[PDB]
Amino acid sequence: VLTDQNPIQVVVDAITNTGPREDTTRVGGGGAARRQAVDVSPLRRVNQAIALLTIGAREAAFRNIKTIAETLAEELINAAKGSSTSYAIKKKDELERVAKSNR
Amino acid sequence: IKIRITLTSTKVKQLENVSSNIVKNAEQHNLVKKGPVRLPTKVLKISTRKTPNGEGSKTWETYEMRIHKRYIDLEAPVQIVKRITQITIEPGVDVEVVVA
Amino acid sequence: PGVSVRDVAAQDFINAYASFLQRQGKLEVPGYVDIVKTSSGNEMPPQDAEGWFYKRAASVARHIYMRKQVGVGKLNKLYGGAKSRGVRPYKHIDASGSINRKVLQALEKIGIVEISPKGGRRISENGQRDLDRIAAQTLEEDE
Amino acid sequence: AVPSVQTFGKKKSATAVAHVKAGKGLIKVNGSPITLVEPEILRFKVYEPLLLVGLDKFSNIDIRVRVTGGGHVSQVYAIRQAIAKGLVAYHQKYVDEQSKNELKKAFTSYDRTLLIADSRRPEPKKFGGKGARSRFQKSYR
Amino acid sequence: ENVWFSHPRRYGKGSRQCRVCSSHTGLIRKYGLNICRQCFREKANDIGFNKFR
Amino acid sequence: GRVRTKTVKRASKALIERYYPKLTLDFQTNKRLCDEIATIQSKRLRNKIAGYTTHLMKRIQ
Amino acid sequence: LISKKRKLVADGVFYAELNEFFTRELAEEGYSGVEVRVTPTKTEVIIRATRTQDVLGENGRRINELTLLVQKRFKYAPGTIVLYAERVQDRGLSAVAQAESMKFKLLNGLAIRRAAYGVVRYVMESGAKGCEVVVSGKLRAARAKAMKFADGFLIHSGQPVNDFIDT
Amino acid sequence: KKKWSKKSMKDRAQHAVILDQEKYDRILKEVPTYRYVSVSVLVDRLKIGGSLARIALRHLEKEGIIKPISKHSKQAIYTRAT
Amino acid sequence: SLVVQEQGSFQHILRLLNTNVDGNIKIVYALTTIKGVGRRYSNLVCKKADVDLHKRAGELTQEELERIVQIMQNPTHYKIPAWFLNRQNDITDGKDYHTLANNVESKLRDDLERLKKIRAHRGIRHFWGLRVRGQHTKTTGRRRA
RNA sequence: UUAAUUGCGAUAACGAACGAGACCUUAACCUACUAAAUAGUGGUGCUAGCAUUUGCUGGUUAUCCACUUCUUAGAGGGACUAUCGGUUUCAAGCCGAUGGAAGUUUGAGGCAAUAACAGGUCUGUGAUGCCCUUAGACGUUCUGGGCCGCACGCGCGCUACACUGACGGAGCCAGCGAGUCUAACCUUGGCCGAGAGGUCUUGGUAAUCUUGUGAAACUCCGUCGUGCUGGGGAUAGAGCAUUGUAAUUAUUGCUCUUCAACGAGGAAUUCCUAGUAAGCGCAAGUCAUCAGCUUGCGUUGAUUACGUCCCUGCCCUUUGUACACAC
């Protein structure tokens, strides 16, 4: 109804646009803490992309008049067009920036 | 006269040959009858703590026992309740003659 | 054709039979319709207020059609549900026996359900024909 | 002696027997038409065997299915498996392999669950927890 | 006298005792065993109760 | 793991010790022949004994 | 009258009560076991022991007394239950007989080492493939320690131990 | 004791409970511009309470403009029918 | 469409039985504010008064609130079940009563004081401040003082 | 190399035993056997409703006939990683693809070695050595309290902290298991009561009757609205019944009313790799009455690994030791 293309196409491009490409890992080894950046497999990219979209709409539907249906729709549409208001897009920015700083 | 041979036991092998002997005595002479009906086994289960005292990790048990019930349906006049009544009883299994 | 009560969806038929029970209220209206809670598990009386008695009668009669014999306890168990016993967990609670009794006797007065052998009730011969005639109507209303 | 076949099907604990005889195209479950499911979402899941290959093979058969056991989805999975095996059984007592073999290939080409039942069954509960793998909350101090 | 055992023990644990040792507390009244659990383990394989699973 | 127990290992070698041609190069044909030759009280045990025997029948070729 | 589930639970209790009574009364007679055969009206309870002459005893008064003893306990009717006396076969392969025999030797005052090794030698010379006896308690001191006398091989796990080993 | 949690909602902007006139002209001229309309949409943008959208969503569906693309359990999806 | 306008008769607040009755909510639930009236009793009062249940508290004609009010102060006269009252078989007289906003709290103090004066177990424990229904207090009921 | 001193093989060792494995039970497969109104199926008669045009939906043990696909079983079969392609002295084996109902020892349990705790129990035992004690007895028994008592601190658990919701209608599907004889159990059905419950009867010693346990979570229509509110039901007041000789510091059940904390929980910590977790209810155990417990059963059914010794621990070998009640 909104953003009149094929919704299946919208779903697939959203997950390909919110899947992190670089990520940090634990390497504390021996000495309090320390991060270190690594890469993300394509399978983990899809898994992380789906998880971020689901948790973002679920949290945004917590104690809110908007139902989970429109919250999921708004989250997927906004992530599809790569806008900053998406929870998943913002989370992808955080992980990539953290990995970039600890490169 | 609707003689029915009811057999209950805990040993399947001993109950099987008793039915086999009863059914083999049935298929001799004429004795048109109904074969062994296989009732579901009644499995008793009493679950109890292994510990006689209260100390110890929670480890329960299950003492089970299976009852196999099969009935044999006969149909003939008195000329076989002089003959079927000769019980082929082994230790364990029991017989209860019921007419009509 | 060969349509019957089994050739219809539940929601449409019960509403249709409720529709063809409110327009002429021949069956009965008990005096305590507006004060019952339908069970000891339900916390609030039904919000249908004006009706809800022919709605239950429609559901009961349709339930009778597909079965042979039932009882008031059987209706209580079917129409019951879980009860919120405070902080204690939920538990199944039977419905109000008087409500199903009044409905069942009311269906006897009109001539839709009568007593059957081996105990219990059973759909009536006049009951079967009118209930089937309802199915022939509700399908063609949408047509 | 009128043409007829019979099958069976299970999902977790349900059973569904399809007495597929020779008829004018009647698909009924518990005396109700196929279009009256209950989840109203898996209606197309039980519509499956109707629509993978086409309705032309369904025009000379009547599938009557009786179901008992399991949840609403389990009943649905019982119905779809029974009618799918009912279709092949009707093709496995009258009609040729080309009708049957590409029928019985295409059904599994989409999903193996149409003919092959789900092998997984509930596992027994072990003492010390609410389930088999699950255990009660243990603590120290 | 009439006061020695006037108390009505027919509806509780005091009205039931084991057939082996007449022990109180835990008993097995299931299937009318009327035997307490701890000696039931000792004589389990006398009544036909085995353990396969 | 599929590591065979010494019980099926030693018996299979003893079977081929005196019965070269009896154990054919296929599993199903000689699986029942092993039962006819050795007293085995378990259907599972004779199934694994024939499996190792057939595999040994293939290796010797 | 009584359902099948309760009836078979009762007869096992009947077996348990009868077995323990015979064990406590005919302990000195080398009692081994009992078979409770039930048949309509009359029932036969075959008793297995080594000293079958003493089991019947003095023309048979004791065995008649034992028949009369279980008569009043089990609330039967005159002539309904008959007690038999069958001699125990392979007496060297009956752990119940050896357990009682060891108890009498220990009670008399015979050396534990001689009795324990004497009985195990008697067991395997009778045609057994293995035996094992454990004596535990206060021996030679106050602190309790267990002694293990064994020869041959004894399986400890699986179905066959229940099928084969008598404990 | 200590909670380690916040306790506040916001500022409840309670609004129409009975449909008035000055917003009756509003709704008839403002919802026909909604590409996507539902219960929650006019709750937020049009600022309508609980038991007025359901009547208003039933209003135009029976009368005019917006059309039932998908009206179902707990979700009444309607478009900008024109 | 079941849409109607408003002319100005809506009142954002009510006052029944000497208590605050807030508007903007349905009448069946806006009457629950009265101390001694719950969801079921308010539903019963509204049902016998024929006040069009789907009506806000503010959008109520004044001729219906008095009819509701009179039912509150005398339920048994208007065919209300005898088993639908909070104070049944009063210890003073025995007639089936129904305490109201100010009567619910006041009558509660009288029965505790009657229990206290007679030196009963419930009365003394009420004065002490502990449980009077037999609950455990070893690990429960801590943050009370 | 294996889950495994489980095997290949090496080799002052050879031959062995226990454990593991093997074995047993259960869950899956059998349209192949034996069958069966205490389980069913189809057909022939009787009979009902809709349309009558050809049918569909039903009811019916003395209306009979035929069958065992589904329902239960007993005797059996099947699964051995089978084949192929890679990896390996090219051995044990491992991996991927090539059947199946089942290819993580098919899954899950039972059984479970030597040695040991100075582990728990004399409150299971008419199994107990010793000490105390045995008649105003520390025995048994009677009456009434007590084990529930709360300034406070912890461990298992149940409700939630509302919209993937709550409430009111409808659809509304399971499995395990139990049930009375000289007692009074499971109770069907009809009647009365808002309900709890009461009443007159019926069936059942049990696949037969309770029971198709018509269970709940679940789904469709509506009420509601982001509101310490229709969320949530602690705390109390009044009344109505059941169990018992007795209920008072309410056994419990039912009705009305009072409507408190709680808005996702801090240091820290528990469980988990598939029908498993989790959500959901049911049966059984204790039981005259009382589940928020336990033991089992089934219903809906995710995400996340196919790895590591980083943390917490285990096995073998080498090494060091001023340890031996042994870091």
CSV table of N, CA and C (backbone and C1' of nucleotides) in Angstrom, one decimal, chain J residues 121-160:
chain,number,residue,atom,x,y,z
J,121,U,P,22.9,-37.6,58.9
J,121,U,O5',21.9,-38.9,58.8
J,121,U,C5',20.5,-38.7,58.5
J,121,U,C4',19.8,-40.0,58.5
J,121,U,C3',20.1,-41.0,59.6
J,121,U,O3',19.6,-40.6,60.9
J,121,U,C1',20.2,-42.2,57.6
J,122,C,P,18.0,-40.7,61.2
J,122,C,O5',17.9,-42.2,62.0
J,122,C,C5',19.0,-42.8,62.6
J,122,C,C4',18.7,-44.1,63.3
J,122,C,C3',18.2,-43.9,64.7
J,122,C,O3',17.3,-45.0,65.0
J,122,C,C1',20.2,-45.2,64.7
J,123,U,P,15.8,-44.7,65.5
J,123,U,O5',15.1,-43.9,64.3
J,123,U,C5',14.5,-42.6,64.5
J,123,U,C4',13.7,-42.2,63.3
J,123,U,C3',14.5,-41.9,62.1
J,123,U,O3',13.7,-42.3,60.9
J,123,U,C1',13.2,-40.0,62.7
J,124,G,P,14.5,-42.7,59.6
J,124,G,O5',13.5,-43.8,58.9
J,124,G,C5',12.1,-43.8,59.1
J,124,G,C4',11.5,-45.1,58.7
J,124,G,C3',12.0,-46.3,59.5
J,124,G,O3',11.4,-46.4,60.8
J,124,G,C1',12.0,-46.8,57.2
J,125,U,P,12.2,-47.1,62.0
J,125,U,O5',12.2,-48.6,61.6
J,125,U,C5',11.0,-49.4,61.4
J,125,U,C4',11.3,-50.7,60.7
J,125,U,C3',12.2,-51.7,61.4
J,125,U,O3',11.5,-52.5,62.4
J,125,U,C1',12.9,-51.4,59.2
J,126,G,P,11.3,-51.9,63.9
J,126,G,O5',11.1,-53.2,64.8
J,126,G,C5',12.3,-54.0,65.1
J,126,G,C4',12.2,-55.4,64.7
J,126,G,C3',11.7,-55.7,63.2
J,126,G,O3',12.3,-56.8,62.7
J,126,G,C1',10.2,-56.7,64.8
J,127,A,P,12.7,-56.8,61.1
J,127,A,O5',14.1,-56.1,60.9
J,127,A,C5',14.9,-55.8,62.1
J,127,A,C4',16.3,-56.2,61.9
J,127,A,C3',17.2,-55.9,63.1
J,127,A,O3',17.1,-56.9,64.1
J,127,A,C1',18.2,-55.2,61.1
J,128,U,P,17.4,-56.5,65.6
J,128,U,O5',19.0,-56.4,65.7
J,128,U,C5',19.6,-55.5,66.6
J,128,U,C4',20.8,-54.8,66.0
J,128,U,C3',21.6,-53.9,66.9
J,128,U,O3',22.4,-54.5,67.9
J,128,U,C1',21.3,-52.9,64.8
J,129,G,P,21.9,-54.8,69.4
J,129,G,O5',23.3,-54.9,70.2
J,129,G,C5',24.3,-55.8,69.8
J,129,G,C4',25.7,-55.1,69.8
J,129,G,C3',25.9,-54.2,71.0
J,129,G,O3',26.2,-54.9,72.2
J,129,G,C1',26.6,-53.1,69.1
J,130,C,P,25.5,-54.6,73.6
J,130,C,O5',26.0,-53.2,74.0
J,130,C,C5',27.4,-53.0,74.2
J,130,C,C4',27.7,-51.5,74.3
J,130,C,C3',26.9,-50.7,75.3
J,130,C,O3',27.4,-50.8,76.6
J,130,C,C1',27.0,-49.6,73.2
J,131,C,P,26.3,-50.7,77.8
J,131,C,O5',26.0,-49.1,77.9
J,131,C,C5',27.0,-48.2,78.2
J,131,C,C4',26.5,-46.8,78.0
J,131,C,C3',25.2,-46.4,78.8
J,131,C,O3',25.5,-46.1,80.1
J,131,C,C1',25.1,-45.6,76.5
J,132,C,P,24.4,-46.6,81.2
J,132,C,O5',23.2,-45.6,81.0
J,132,C,C5',23.4,-44.2,81.2
J,132,C,C4',22.1,-43.4,80.7
J,132,C,C3',20.8,-43.9,81.3
J,132,C,O3',20.6,-43.4,82.6
J,132,C,C1',20.6,-43.6,79.0
J,133,U,P,20.0,-44.4,83.7
J,133,U,O5',18.5,-44.6,83.3
J,133,U,C5',17.6,-43.5,83.1
J,133,U,C4',16.3,-43.9,82.3
J,133,U,C3',15.5,-45.1,82.9
J,133,U,O3',14.7,-44.7,83.9
J,133,U,C1',15.8,-45.3,80.5
J,134,U,P,14.5,-45.7,85.2
J,134,U,O5',13.2,-46.5,84.8
J,134,U,C5',12.1,-45.8,84.2
J,134,U,C4',11.1,-46.8,83.5
J,134,U,C3',10.8,-48.1,84.3
J,134,U,O3',9.8,-47.9,85.2
J,134,U,C1',11.4,-48.6,82.1
J,135,A,P,10.1,-47.8,86.8
J,135,A,O5',8.8,-47.2,87.5
J,135,A,C5',8.4,-45.8,87.2
J,135,A,C4',6.9,-45.7,87.1
J,135,A,C3',6.1,-46.3,88.2
J,135,A,O3',4.9,-45.5,88.5
J,135,A,C1',5.4,-47.3,86.2
J,136,G,P,4.7,-44.8,89.9
J,136,G,O5',5.3,-43.4,89.8
J,136,G,C5',5.3,-42.7,88.5
J,136,G,C4',4.5,-41.5,88.5
J,136,G,C3',4.8,-40.4,87.5
J,136,G,O3',4.3,-40.6,86.2
J,136,G,C1',4.5,-39.4,89.6
J,137,A,P,5.1,-41.5,85.1
J,137,A,O5',6.6,-41.0,85.2
J,137,A,C5',7.6,-41.9,85.6
J,137,A,C4',8.5,-42.3,84.4
J,137,A,C3',8.1,-41.9,83.1
J,137,A,O3',8.4,-40.5,82.8
J,137,A,C1',8.7,-44.1,83.0
J,138,C,P,8.0,-39.8,81.4
J,138,C,O5',9.3,-40.1,80.5
J,138,C,C5',9.5,-39.3,79.3
J,138,C,C4',10.2,-40.0,78.2
J,138,C,C3',9.9,-41.5,78.2
J,138,C,O3',9.9,-42.0,76.8
J,138,C,C1',12.3,-41.1,78.3
J,139,G,P,8.6,-41.7,75.9
J,139,G,O5',8.0,-43.1,75.6
J,139,G,C5',8.8,-44.1,75.0
J,139,G,C4',8.1,-45.5,75.1
J,139,G,C3',6.6,-45.5,74.6
J,139,G,O3',6.4,-45.6,73.2
J,139,G,C1',6.8,-46.5,76.8
J,140,U,P,5.8,-44.4,72.4
J,140,U,O5',4.2,-44.8,72.3
J,140,U,C5',3.8,-46.0,71.9
J,140,U,C4',2.6,-46.5,72.6
J,140,U,C3',1.4,-45.5,72.6
J,140,U,O3',0.6,-45.6,71.4
J,140,U,C1',1.7,-46.2,74.8
J,141,U,P,0.0,-44.3,70.7
J,141,U,O5',-1.2,-43.8,71.6
J,141,U,C5',-2.3,-44.7,71.9
J,141,U,C4',-3.0,-44.3,73.1
J,141,U,C3',-3.6,-42.9,73.1
J,141,U,O3',-4.8,-42.7,72.3
J,141,U,C1',-2.6,-43.3,75.2
J,142,C,P,-5.1,-41.3,71.6
J,142,C,O5',-5.8,-40.5,72.8
J,142,C,C5',-6.9,-40.9,73.5
J,142,C,C4',-7.4,-40.0,74.6
J,142,C,C3',-7.4,-38.5,74.2
J,142,C,O3',-8.5,-38.1,73.4
J,142,C,C1',-6.3,-38.7,76.2
J,143,U,P,-8.4,-37.0,72.3
J,143,U,O5',-8.4,-35.6,73.1
J,143,U,C5',-9.4,-35.3,73.9
J,143,U,C4',-9.1,-34.0,74.7
J,143,U,C3',-8.5,-32.9,73.9
J,143,U,O3',-9.5,-32.1,73.2
J,143,U,C1',-7.2,-33.2,75.9
J,144,G,P,-9.1,-31.5,71.7
J,144,G,O5',-8.2,-30.2,72.1
J,144,G,C5',-8.8,-29.2,72.8
J,144,G,C4',-7.7,-28.2,73.3
J,144,G,C3',-6.8,-27.7,72.1
J,144,G,O3',-7.4,-26.7,71.3
J,144,G,C1',-5.5,-28.3,74.1
J,145,G,P,-6.7,-26.3,70.0
J,145,G,O5',-5.6,-25.2,70.4
J,145,G,C5',-4.5,-24.8,69.6
J,145,G,C4',-3.3,-24.5,70.4
J,145,G,C3',-2.0,-24.4,69.7
J,145,G,O3',-1.8,-23.1,69.0
J,145,G,C1',-1.7,-25.7,71.6
J,146,G,P,-1.4,-23.1,67.5
J,146,G,O5',0.1,-23.6,67.5
J,146,G,C5',1.1,-22.9,68.3
J,146,G,C4',2.4,-23.7,68.3
J,146,G,C3',2.9,-24.2,67.0
J,146,G,O3',3.6,-23.3,66.3
J,146,G,C1',3.0,-26.0,68.6
J,147,C,P,3.3,-23.0,64.7
J,147,C,O5',4.3,-23.9,63.9
J,147,C,C5',5.7,-23.7,64.2
J,147,C,C4',6.5,-25.0,63.9
J,147,C,C3',6.4,-25.5,62.5
J,147,C,O3',7.4,-24.9,61.6
J,147,C,C1',6.0,-27.3,64.0
J,148,C,P,7.0,-24.6,60.1
J,148,C,O5',5.7,-23.7,60.1
J,148,C,C5',5.7,-22.5,60.8
J,148,C,C4',4.8,-21.5,60.0
J,148,C,C3',4.3,-20.3,60.8
J,148,C,O3',4.2,-19.1,60.0
J,148,C,C1',2.4,-21.5,60.1
J,149,G,P,5.2,-17.9,60.2
J,149,G,O5',4.9,-17.4,61.7
J,149,G,C5',3.6,-16.9,62.0
J,149,G,C4',3.4,-16.8,63.5
J,149,G,C3',4.2,-15.8,64.2
J,149,G,O3',3.6,-14.5,64.2
J,149,G,C1',4.5,-17.9,65.3
J,150,C,P,4.0,-13.4,63.1
J,150,C,O5',5.1,-12.5,63.8
J,150,C,C5',5.2,-11.1,63.6
J,150,C,C4',6.6,-10.6,63.3
J,150,C,C3',6.8,-10.2,61.9
J,150,C,O3',7.8,-9.1,61.9
J,150,C,C1',8.3,-12.0,62.5
J,151,A,P,7.3,-7.6,61.8
J,151,A,O5',8.6,-6.8,62.3
J,151,A,C5',9.4,-7.2,63.3
J,151,A,C4',10.7,-6.4,63.4
J,151,A,C3',11.5,-6.3,62.1
J,151,A,O3',11.0,-5.3,61.2
J,151,A,C1',12.9,-6.8,63.9
J,152,C,P,11.1,-5.5,59.7
J,152,C,O5',12.7,-5.7,59.5
J,152,C,C5',13.2,-6.4,58.4
J,152,C,C4',14.6,-7.0,58.7
J,152,C,C3',15.2,-7.9,57.6
J,152,C,O3',15.8,-7.1,56.6
J,152,C,C1',15.3,-9.0,59.6
J,153,G,P,15.9,-7.6,55.1
J,153,G,O5',16.9,-8.8,55.1
J,153,G,C5',18.3,-8.6,55.4
J,153,G,C4',19.1,-9.9,55.2
J,153,G,C3',18.8,-10.6,53.9
J,153,G,O3',19.4,-10.1,52.7
J,153,G,C1',18.9,-12.2,55.7
J,154,C,P,19.0,-10.6,51.3
J,154,C,O5',19.9,-11.8,51.0
J,154,C,C5',19.6,-12.8,50.0
J,154,C,C4',20.0,-14.2,50.4
J,154,C,C3',19.4,-15.3,49.5
J,154,C,O3',20.2,-15.5,48.4
J,154,C,C1',19.0,-15.8,51.8
J,155,G,P,19.5,-15.7,47.0
J,155,G,O5',19.0,-17.2,47.0
J,155,G,C5',19.9,-18.3,47.3
J,155,G,C4',19.2,-19.6,47.2
J,155,G,C3',18.2,-19.8,46.0
J,155,G,O3',18.9,-20.0,44.8
J,155,G,C1',17.2,-20.6,48.0
J,156,C,P,18.0,-20.0,43.4
J,156,C,O5',17.4,-21.4,43.3
J,156,C,C5',16.2,-21.6,42.5
J,156,C,C4',15.4,-22.8,43.1
J,156,C,C3',14.0,-23.0,42.4
J,156,C,O3',14.1,-23.7,41.2
J,156,C,C1',13.8,-23.0,44.8
J,157,G,P,13.3,-23.2,39.9
J,157,G,O5',11.8,-23.3,40.3
J,157,G,C5',10.8,-22.5,39.7
J,157,G,C4',9.5,-22.5,40.6
J,157,G,C3',8.5,-21.5,40.1
J,157,G,O3',7.7,-22.0,39.0
J,157,G,C1',8.7,-21.3,42.4
J,158,C,P,7.3,-21.1,37.8
J,158,C,O5',5.9,-20.4,38.2
J,158,C,C5',4.8,-21.3,38.5
J,158,C,C4',3.8,-20.5,39.2
J,158,C,C3',3.3,-19.2,38.5
J,158,C,O3',2.4,-19.4,37.5
J,158,C,C1',3.7,-18.7,40.8
J,159,U,P,2.1,-18.4,36.3
J,159,U,O5',1.0,-17.4,37.0
J,159,U,C5',0.6,-16.2,36.3
J,159,U,C4',0.3,-15.1,37.2
J,159,U,C3',0.6,-13.7,36.7
J,159,U,O3',-0.5,-13.2,35.9
J,159,U,C1',1.6,-13.9,38.8
J,160,A,P,-0.5,-13.2,34.3
J,160,A,O5',1.1,-12.9,34.0
J,160,A,C5',1.4,-11.7,33.3
J,160,A,C4',1.5,-10.5,34.2
J,160,A,C3',2.2,-9.3,33.7
J,160,A,O3',1.4,-8.5,32.9
J,160,A,C1',2.9,-9.8,35.9
